[PDB]
Amino acid sequence: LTLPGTAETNLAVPSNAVRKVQPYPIAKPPSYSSVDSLRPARVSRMDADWATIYEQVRRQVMGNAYVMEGEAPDIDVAFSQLKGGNLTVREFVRAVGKSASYRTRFMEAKSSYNFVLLNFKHFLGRAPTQEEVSTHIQILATSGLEAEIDSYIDSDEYKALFGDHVVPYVVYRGTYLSSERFNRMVKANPGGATSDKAKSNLNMIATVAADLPTDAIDVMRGLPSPITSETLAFGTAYYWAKVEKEASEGRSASPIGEKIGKFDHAPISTYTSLCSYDKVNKAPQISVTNVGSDEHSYVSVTSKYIAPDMAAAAQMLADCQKYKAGGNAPTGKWMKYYPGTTVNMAPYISLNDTGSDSSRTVSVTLDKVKIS
Amino acid sequence: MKSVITTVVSAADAAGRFPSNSDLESIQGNIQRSAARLEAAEKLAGNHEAVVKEAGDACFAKYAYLKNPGEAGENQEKINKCYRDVDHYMRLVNYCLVVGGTGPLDEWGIAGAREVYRTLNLPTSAYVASIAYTRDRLCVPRDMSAQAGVEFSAYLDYLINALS
Amino acid sequence: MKSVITTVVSAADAAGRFPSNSDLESIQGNIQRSAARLEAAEKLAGNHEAVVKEAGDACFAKYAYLKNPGEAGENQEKINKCYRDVDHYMRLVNYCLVVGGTGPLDEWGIAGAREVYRTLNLPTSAYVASIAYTRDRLCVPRDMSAQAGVEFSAYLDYLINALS
Amino acid sequence: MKSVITTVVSAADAAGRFPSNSDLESIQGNIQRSAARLEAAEKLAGNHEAVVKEAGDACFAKYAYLKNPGEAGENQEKINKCYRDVDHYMRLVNYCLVVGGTGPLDEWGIAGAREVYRTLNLPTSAYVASIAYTRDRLCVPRDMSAQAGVEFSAYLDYLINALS
Amino acid sequence: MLDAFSRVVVNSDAKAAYVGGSDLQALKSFIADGNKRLDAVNSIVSNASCMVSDAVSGMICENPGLISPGGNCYTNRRMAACLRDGEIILRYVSYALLAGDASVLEDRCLNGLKETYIALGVPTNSSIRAVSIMKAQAVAFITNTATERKMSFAAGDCTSLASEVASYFDRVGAAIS
Amino acid sequence: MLDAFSRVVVNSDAKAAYVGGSDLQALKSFIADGNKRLDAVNSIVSNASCMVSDAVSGMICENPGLISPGGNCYTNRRMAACLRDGEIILRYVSYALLAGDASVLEDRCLNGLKETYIALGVPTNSSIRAVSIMKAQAVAFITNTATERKMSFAAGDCTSLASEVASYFDRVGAAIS
Amino acid sequence: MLDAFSRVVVNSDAKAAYVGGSDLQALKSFIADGNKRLDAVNSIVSNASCMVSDAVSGMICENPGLISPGGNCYTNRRMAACLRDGEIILRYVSYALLAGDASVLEDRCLNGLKETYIALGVPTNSSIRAVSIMKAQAVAFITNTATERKMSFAAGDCTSLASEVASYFDRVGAAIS
Numbered sequence A: 001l002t003l004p005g006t007a008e009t010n011l012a013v014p015s016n017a018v019r020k021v022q023p024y025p026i027a028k029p030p031s032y033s034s035v036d037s038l039r040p041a042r043v044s045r046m047d048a049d050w051a052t053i054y055e056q057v058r059r060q061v062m063g064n065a066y067v068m069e070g071e072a073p074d075i076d077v078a079f080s081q082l083k084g085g086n087l088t089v090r091e092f093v094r095a096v097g098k099s100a101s102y103r104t105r106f107m108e109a110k111s112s113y114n115f116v117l118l119n120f121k122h123f124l125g126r127a128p129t130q131e132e133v134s135t136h137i138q139i140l141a142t143s144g145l146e147a148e149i150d151s152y153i154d155s156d157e158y159k160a161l162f163g164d165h166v167v168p169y170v171v172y173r174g175t176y177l178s179s180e181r182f183n184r185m186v187k188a189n190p191g192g193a194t195s196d197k198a199k200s201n202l203n204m205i206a207t208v209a210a211d212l213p214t215d216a217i218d219v220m221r222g223l224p225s226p227i228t229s230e231t232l233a234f235g236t237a238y239y240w241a242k243v244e245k246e247a248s249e250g251r252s253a254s255p256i257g258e259k260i261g262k263f264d265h266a267p268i269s270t271y272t273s274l275c276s277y278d279k280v281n282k283a284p285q286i287s288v289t290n291v292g293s294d295e296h297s298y299v300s301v302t303s304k305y306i307a308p309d310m311a312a313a314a315q316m317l318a319d320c321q322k323y324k325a326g327g328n329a330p331t332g333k334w335m336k337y338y339p340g341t342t343v344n345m346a347p348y349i350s351l352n353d354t355g356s357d358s359s360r361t362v363s364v365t366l367d368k369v370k371i372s
Numbered sequence B, C, D: 001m002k003s004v005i006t007t008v009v010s011a012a013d014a015a016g017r018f019p020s021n022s023d024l025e026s027i028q029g030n031i032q033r034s035a036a037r038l039e040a041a042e043k044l045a046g047n048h049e050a051v052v053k054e055a056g057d058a059c060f061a062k063y064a065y066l067k068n069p070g071e072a073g074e075n076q077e078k079i080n081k082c083y084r085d086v087d088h089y090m091r092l093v094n095y096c097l098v099v100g101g102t103g104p105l106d107e108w109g110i111a112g113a114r115e116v117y118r119t120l121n122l123p124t125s126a127y128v129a130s131i132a133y134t135r136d137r138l139c140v141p142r143d144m145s146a147q148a149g150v151e152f153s154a155y156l157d158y159l160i161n162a163l164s
Numbered sequence E, F, G: 001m002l003d004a005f006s007r008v009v010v011n012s013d014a015k016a017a018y019v020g021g022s023d024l025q026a027l028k029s030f031i032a033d034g035n036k037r038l039d040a041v042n043s044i045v046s047n048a049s050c051m052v053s054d055a056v057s058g059m060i061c062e063n064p065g066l067i068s069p070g071g072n073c074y075t076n077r078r079m080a081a082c083l084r085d086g087e088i089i090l091r092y093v094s095y096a097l098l099a100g101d102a103s104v105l106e107d108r109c110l111n112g113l114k115e116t117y118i119a120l121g122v123p124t125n126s127s128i129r130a131v132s133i134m135k136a137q138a139v140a141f142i143t144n145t146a147t148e149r150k151m152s153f154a155a156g157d158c159t160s161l162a163s164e165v166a167s168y169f170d171r172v173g174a175a176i177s
């Protein structure tokens, strides 16, 4: 809408008011990158026509959206200026991302954490780290949608990889800033016939990019690698590991079990009296409200709640270092074993009949709200 | 536009390399096929007024309902608009027989046809009724050579497959 | 790999469309050229042991300095590596006469040559002395036909232009 | 974390290269400066019980208003929380004297200060009253050396400049 | 974007005329030197790496003010750009000799080429000299008058292609001037 | 990410203790071999292109199943990656010798290298042999016991750093195994 | 970006003035014809697809120089553009009917509409004629004097909004001329 020549909008850096448009598209990154020779060639503004620039912007920025002809007129607004040269293809995907057709299939329907991971998949063509999420999740908290898409397009990572004339694509650069950052990019970017719309939870890179260890599974990276770079290893060897994974990646089998949350349970023969291993760690999940006379009351047996292994980490490591001075004055004993133990009567309250008392011995130590 | 020449020099441009021996091999295909398609161009150019008079009314022979008032054919002059509306397609098939690719057909005749035929309420089935009447009337001894009628049919159904 | 057929089915896939009349047209070019290049391929396969012996020694006739100690060819076995290091290229020229494009020569012999041969200190001027020794020894009466000698030469200087 | 060592390593890693002569020359500075700040670290370690007691109440003498009921200091335990809430700052100043940069100050004490201290309504002016009371009481004969004194003060005002 | 076949249809689109036998015989003569044009593009890209290095060192050895410091081809980065910048000019004329008309390189390479070289500080008077050598080297190959490399062909005339590529190499000479 | 100076602060951050005069003298001895550590990083990156080219050809010359077709170092594309793939291991061990602890290569290069090589089809047991040659060459340089190249130093002990670099080359050994 | 309720607050921001009783009755008059405004823009978007198709074909049927080859609306792509291009003019004027002031289309559609049409080659004088038919059809709907289609409404005056649509449709014609 703005001008027939516009390199940069919104005046974020000071040196874009004097910056020309790029007269030619930018070069490839200068490292070796053995994978990209098997890859198809990148599509730019000045080598290809508008039939395939629109398809690859749908194949990368829109994921695989299946935009119809009456669907997305906001993209048809933004595409009609790109064919007139009124904005570059760098600014065009800023107009695609800020549009509501990108919002009404990736922002409202996916989750809050998954919206950041799809933005690195579409705009930068990779998958972020945890520190890249934690700087991008605050823009969704304090500044909203429009400033968060400005963090990709006005970044220096975009302008060095694509510039103003190159459609976004999966850039294999060989020497990466992290060894995770290759194979988390590859896992985030599968090949053809995959979209983002069915996986309303993505749930697998949402927990590999969540904690900084637990790099993702090898068959989830041998799957979208290119060809004469996967073969003689995907006939039937890892192929059943790929199919088993695809029925788990599809329908979003939540990886509490095998990926993170890793608890050595006891064998089933060890208890056998608290039996029926479907039910073994189930508790009543009770909830009361007690407001007026329209407030419902809880109860819906809970699931097999696991020891969380970090609340047992803050507890028993940060504290309970009451590991100090345990000689406890060994009085030439005969405490007939276990020492100062009160009989501890504890009368169960005499509601006049059918209520009775039992006792039990225990070692007693005075508490820490007891000194004073 | 989208021809066999500009397919193999846009793909060489996108890879950023010289015209290799693969790209020189497709242009050898043009020496064997221009002797099939260029006499299909001048057979079309020497008979173009006949094949729009003989075959533009075949849609009206099929669909006489649109000459009712209140429809896409109201008066005589919109039917005189219609033979101008269909010889452009026969000029574009003549433009694609001489190119060899399908280049002049897309951005001149197809790209945007779903927007102008819906909004101005033209039925696209009566378009391809006139195009498919031209398609099944090909024959070997009268019309053209035996190989030209393969390729002249092969551009007409591309207009059918894109409009439908 | 990068043949004449995988250019036109990838560029049709990049636009997201069917094989049009330009894409079927390029494969008709393969009918006129496979008569020429495949009889250059079987001439190469039945004579590959001779064209790496009395054309692999010619780089050592030009560069006798690299048989010195401290150089790229030290002992007998690295020279025995070296004729295997040449015969893989003539296997790839035999793999690109049979394909039709420069597909199997690119990612199997060319892509990665500037990083291996620089790091292993292997002089690429003594590669292209052996490749261009084969190139100028073509002739019409003895070796092949008059047209296969155009095309077998046309893949060798592509290997020269990639290494230099 | 953000030290002199992980500055010249991460910048060499982002350029994708070996540690050059410029990165080795930065570590030669660390021999010349660890004689100064590691005797600034033990003077903070052997005196941290004193410099949070007579520099934690100096905010309260400056700001006696916040011990009123309804304010950020209500009872004795929040004042007992408050001396813990400054003891972590003197631990992180001690953690930056031993590292050599502003590594442990930023993501442990600074990154997050504009969100906690606004929402929990803790006035940061009474934070920097307690830090700048410590800063202007340095001297060269009593406390430390003359060279530890400029750089013990050079970490305190960075805590002031990031809080204000 | 536009080959020799589609050049005559946009002349015919302005008149809305059917292409007929009054100018199809002019286009069938383009197919008559079909293998002649095809061998000519093969003769250019055969010795293409030796074409650009002999031309850009021929530009250096007549004007050594670039190798002097402050010159535009002084450092090792700028010579590697100038070896690359002259190769793109060779890479796009080989398209236009294949496509039959100078419209493939006209909007791709030559559009935006004048103001780029004057904003960057490229001496345009020596860029005319650099492409004048490749003008003199392309006509030596496709007329087979090259002194150090002779290629085998079927015998005949190829002067009509030699004037075509010489018309392309002054089109780049016009846009940089 | 973590150096040897900032390693002792996270051992003290878990106890919330001030670093005092009971463990600074172990860190002042890190300053005492400050130039000893510094010349050791210089001795590795001095001959680093001859380091990795002798190491990966040493892995080839004992196991010639990779140059056989179907091998992972067969073609010219994969060997250019494998010449690069062993150089990044040298590029990150020399970071951790400079930084003082195996923290820089641990989360950057090693977190995710095992299943990368599994998913790509890299023979992992031949990557053990590829980095075991670089272990034996790095201890030969910083003890100055290389037979083909001797570098000049001030005389003294460097055998504490010889165990230090060897403790990094099995960390790349264990994290790939 | 600015509605009729917030048009009066940037007037009073320039005086740093609290809004008072001298002009809120001018703003309560805007709420008094609130439902009168609300049915009018509903009458615009009711027969909106028949509005643009009659207007651009009326622009064609008085000036058949664009359907001639070399015209700006000759081919099938440009007619689908010209059907779309005038629909953006209807889509942004109808925003200004709901906003009450010509502000949302002044910066979004019209800010930079002139020099795009002269860089592309649009005949601006026929673009005056094309938007003028949409001016006369918009007053025909909201004053209900459309001959072919009559819609039912509550009785009263709508001539105030009939001057409002003509104040928008010449703002388009001013910024394209």
Ligand SMILES: *C(=C)C1=C(C)[C@@H](Cc2[nH]c(/C=C3N=C(/C=C4\NC(=O)[C@H](C)[C@H]4[C@@H](*)C)C(C)=C\3CCC(=O)O)c(CCC(=O)O)c2C)NC1=O
Binding pocket: A322, A365, A366, A367, A368, A369
């Ligand atoms: C170890 C030296 C040691 C402890 C740890 C601590 C454990 C302990 N706690 C109690 C008594 C109570 N704990 C309660 C639980 C809570 N109080 C709260 O206000 C929050 C909401 C909640 C979680 C912290 C309660 C309500 C009591 C009883 C009242 C009270 O405050 O004491 C005991 C006493 C058990 C007994 O007397 O049999 C113990 C041992 N004390 C330690 O000594």
Ligand SMILES: *[C@H](C)[C@H]1/C(=C/C2=NC(=C\c3[nH]c(C[C@H]4NC(=O)C(C=C)=C4C)c(C)c3CCC(=O)O)/C(CCC(=O)O)=C2C)NC(=O)[C@@H]1C
Binding pocket: A111, A112, A113, A133, A134, A137
């Ligand atoms: C406080 C009540 C909790 C607690 C909170 C923490 N959350 C941390 C990170 C985090 N939390 C969420 C969920 C939340 N953020 C969102 O953006 C959305 C919706 C879109 C929701 C529901 C996410 C997604 C993340 C990751 C992003 C990020 O880390 O910034 C967190 C940080 C952990 C750390 O790195 O140390 C904390 C402390 N933790 C608690 O103990 C109490 C119970």
Ligand SMILES: *[C@H](C)[C@H]1/C(=C/C2=NC(=C\c3[nH]c(C[C@H]4NC(=O)C(C=C)=C4C)c(C)c3CCC(=O)O)/C(CCC(=O)O)=C2C)NC(=O)[C@@H]1C
Binding pocket: A264, A265, A266, A271, A274, A279, A280, A281, A282
């Ligand atoms: C904690 C205060 C105790 C203690 C507890 C441990 N329990 C361990 C395993 C375990 N506990 C139960 C019983 C619990 N689970 C149930 O489902 C139900 C009710 C139906 C109850 C009461 C079971 C059945 C199991 C085994 C199953 C499993 O572990 O998943 C346990 C682990 C032992 C180990 O793995 O080594 C511990 C430590 N032990 C203590 O010291 C205090 C007294």
Ligand SMILES: *[C@H](C)[C@H]1/C(=C/C2=NC(=C\c3[nH]c(C[C@H]4NC(=O)C(C=C)=C4C)c(C)c3CCC(=O)O)/C(CCC(=O)O)=C2C)NC(=O)[C@@H]1C
Binding pocket: A288, A289, A290, A291, A292, A295, A296, A297
């Ligand atoms: C015992 C733990 C307490 C205590 C309990 C009393 N509650 C009395 C009345 C009452 N309690 C509730 C809340 C409760 N009833 C519900 O239906 C629900 C939600 C489902 C809840 C949480 C209600 C609604 C009422 C009725 C009156 C009111 O609205 O407050 C009560 C008086 C009845 C009686 O004498 O038995 C008692 C004694 N009070 C105590 O002193 C201990 C600490």
Ligand SMILES: *[C@H](C)[C@H]1/C(=C/C2=NC(=C\c3[nH]c(C[C@H]4NC(=O)C(C=C)=C4C)c(C)c3CCC(=O)O)/C(CCC(=O)O)=C2C)NC(=O)[C@@H]1C
Binding pocket: A328, A329, A330, A331, A335, A338, A339, A340, A341
């Ligand atoms: C408190 C009012 C007294 C007093 C008490 C102290 N007792 C100490 C240790 C201690 N006390 C007992 C006896 C108690 N423990 C039992 O298990 C039983 C019965 C089964 C009884 C009556 C024992 C056995 C011990 C030694 C074991 C231990 O150290 O806990 C004690 C600690 C002394 C020390 O830490 O050195 C104190 C202070 N002392 C007093 O002054 C008043 C009069």
Ligand SMILES: *[C@H](C)[C@H]1/C(=C/C2=NC(=C\c3[nH]c(C[C@H]4NC(=O)C(C=C)=C4C)c(C)c3CCC(=O)O)/C(CCC(=O)O)=C2C)NC(=O)[C@@H]1C
Binding pocket: A347, A348, A349, A350, A351, A352, A355, A356, A357
């Ligand atoms: C003595 C120190 C007390 C006292 C004791 C009396 N309690 C009498 C009756 C009574 N006591 C209880 C509570 C008791 N019985 C139980 O079964 C349980 C535990 C489950 C307890 C704690 C009950 C329930 C009753 C009966 C209540 C009734 O029926 O009214 C009692 C009356 C004589 C007798 O029944 O033994 C006495 C004297 N009363 C005192 O005044 C001092 C403080």
Ligand SMILES: *[C@H](C)[C@H]1/C(=C/C2=NC(=C\c3[nH]c(C[C@H]4NC(=O)C(C=C)=C4C)c(C)c3CCC(=O)O)/C(CCC(=O)O)=C2C)NC(=O)[C@@H]1C
Binding pocket: B043, B044, B047, B050, B051, B054, B136, B137, B138, B139, B140, B141, B142, B143
């Ligand atoms: C080939 C399919 C058949 C065949 C069919 C007949 N066509 C007859 C007449 C005819 N055809 C046209 C249009 C014609 N002119 C063209 O230039 C082209 C294609 C580019 C076509 C199809 C017209 C106007 C007419 C009627 C008068 C005329 O010849 O101009 C025909 C005569 C009877 C009739 O249909 O009117 C036949 C039998 N002819 C054949 O021999 C093979 C079997």
Ligand SMILES: *[C@H](C)[C@H]1/C(=C/C2=NC(=C\c3[nH]c(C[C@H]4NC(=O)C(C=C)=C4C)c(C)c3CCC(=O)O)/C(CCC(=O)O)=C2C)NC(=O)[C@@H]1C
Binding pocket: C043, C044, C047, C050, C051, C054, C136, C137, C138, C139, C140, C141, C142, C143
């Ligand atoms: C054609 C350029 C000349 C010609 C040259 C001669 N070549 C002679 C021997 C010779 N040539 C080759 C290479 C040849 N064999 C192949 O399989 C291929 C390509 C795949 C080629 C180019 C070899 C290996 C040898 C050695 C012995 C043999 O096999 O013939 C030759 C004899 C003298 C000499 O050895 O140099 C000549 C004169 N021959 C001609 O007639 C035209 C003029």
Ligand SMILES: *[C@H](C)[C@H]1/C(=C/C2=NC(=C\c3[nH]c(C[C@H]4NC(=O)C(C=C)=C4C)c(C)c3CCC(=O)O)/C(CCC(=O)O)=C2C)NC(=O)[C@@H]1C
Binding pocket: D043, D044, D047, D050, D051, D054, D136, D137, D138, D139, D140, D141, D142, D143
């Ligand atoms: C240097 C600026 C002056 C000087 C000032 C005086 N300070 C006095 C007492 C005092 N000083 C400090 C802080 C000091 N101790 C530390 O551990 C550190 C940092 C690690 C510092 C800066 C404290 C906490 C106290 C209170 C009592 C004490 O422990 O000494 C002092 C005596 C009078 C007074 O109490 O203010 C003076 C005059 N002393 C000098 O000689 C130069 C001039």
Ligand SMILES: *[C@H](C)[C@H]1/C(=C/C2=NC(=C\c3[nH]c(C[C@H]4NC(=O)C(C=C)=C4C)c(C)c3CCC(=O)O)/C(CCC(=O)O)=C2C)NC(=O)[C@@H]1C
Binding pocket: B021, B024, B025, B028, C033, C147, C150, C151, E032, E033, E034, E035, E036, E037, E038, E039, E040, E042, E141, E142, E143, E144, E153, E154, E155, E156, E157, E158, E161
């Ligand atoms: C002009 C620059 C040349 C020259 C050209 C002539 N070529 C003639 C025939 C001819 N050329 C080819 C080459 C082309 N075909 C391929 O298969 C490939 C590679 C895949 C290429 C590059 C072929 C097959 C033929 C044979 C065609 C035939 O003769 O039937 C030729 C003879 C006349 C003609 O056919 O046009 C000429 C004059 N010859 C020259 O002297 C200059 C240097």
Ligand SMILES: *[C@H](C)[C@H]1/C(=C/C2=NC(=C\c3[nH]c(C[C@H]4NC(=O)C(C=C)=C4C)c(C)c3CCC(=O)O)/C(CCC(=O)O)=C2C)NC(=O)[C@@H]1C
Binding pocket: D021, D024, D025, D028, F032, F033, F034, F035, F036, F038, F039, F040, F042, F141, F142, F143, F144, F153, F154, F155, F156, F157, F158, F161
């Ligand atoms: C162990 C790998 C070596 C070895 C090391 C020793 N170096 C000693 C002193 C020393 N080292 C440097 C190198 C460092 N300084 C620089 O300027 C640069 C490049 C910019 C580097 C990489 C210097 C200046 C010095 C002199 C310090 C001094 O003596 O005052 C040294 C002597 C003890 C010590 O100073 O630490 C040793 C033992 N020597 C060896 O024999 C092995 C092979």
Ligand SMILES: *[C@H](C)[C@H]1/C(=C/C2=NC(=C\c3[nH]c(C[C@H]4NC(=O)C(C=C)=C4C)c(C)c3CCC(=O)O)/C(CCC(=O)O)=C2C)NC(=O)[C@@H]1C
Binding pocket: G032, G033, G034, G035, G036, G037, G038, G039, G040, G042, G141, G142, G143, G144, G153, G154, G155, G156, G157, G158, G161
């Ligand atoms: C002027 C351009 C029109 C016209 C307008 C009048 N409308 C009058 C009342 C009125 N209008 C609406 C429409 C609006 N409300 C909705 O709920 C919706 C759709 C969701 C729309 C589009 C309503 C509800 C009412 C009733 C309000 C009432 O009378 O209480 C009206 C009478 C005066 C007035 O109330 O403003 C007029 C004059 N009438 C015309 O003749 C032209 C075409």
Ligand SMILES: *[C@H](C)[C@H]1/C(=C/C2=NC(=C\c3[nH]c(C[C@H]4NC(=O)C(C=C)=C4C)c(C)c3CCC(=O)O)/C(CCC(=O)O)=C2C)NC(=O)[C@@H]1C
Binding pocket: A001, A077, A078, A079, A080, A081, A082, A083, A084, A085, A086, G056, G066, G072, G073, G078, G079, G081, G082, G083, G085, G086, G088, G089, G108, G109, G113, G116, G120, G122, G123, G126, G127, G130
């Ligand atoms: C039709 C009544 C006109 C006319 C229209 C044409 N517009 C053409 C391209 C074009 N138009 C616009 C403006 C429009 N698009 C927008 O995005 C917005 C505001 C957000 C508006 C008002 C733009 C930006 C472009 C360039 C983008 C593109 O070309 O798709 C056009 C195509 C020209 C051609 O290529 O032949 C036409 C025909 N032109 C007319 O003659 C009448 C008056």
Ligand SMILES: C=CC1=C(C)[C@@H](Cc2[nH]c(/C=C3N=C(/C=C4\NC(=O)[C@H](C)[C@H]4CC)C(C)=C\3CCC(=O)O)c(CCC(=O)O)c2C)NC1=O
Binding pocket: G047, G050, G051, G054, G055, G057, G058, G059, G061, G062, G132, G133, G136, G137, G140, G141, G145, G146, G147, G148, G149
């Ligand atoms: C030569 C070809 C030719 C045309 C295509 C039409 C197009 C056309 N219509 C109108 C004028 C108009 N056009 C409409 C439009 C419509 N009325 C409806 O009921 C529908 C919703 C919609 C058509 C689908 C209206 C309402 C007017 C105002 C006059 C009227 O009510 O008829 C005008 C004059 C504009 C003006 O008043 O200044 C023109 C040129 N007229 C022509 O002369």
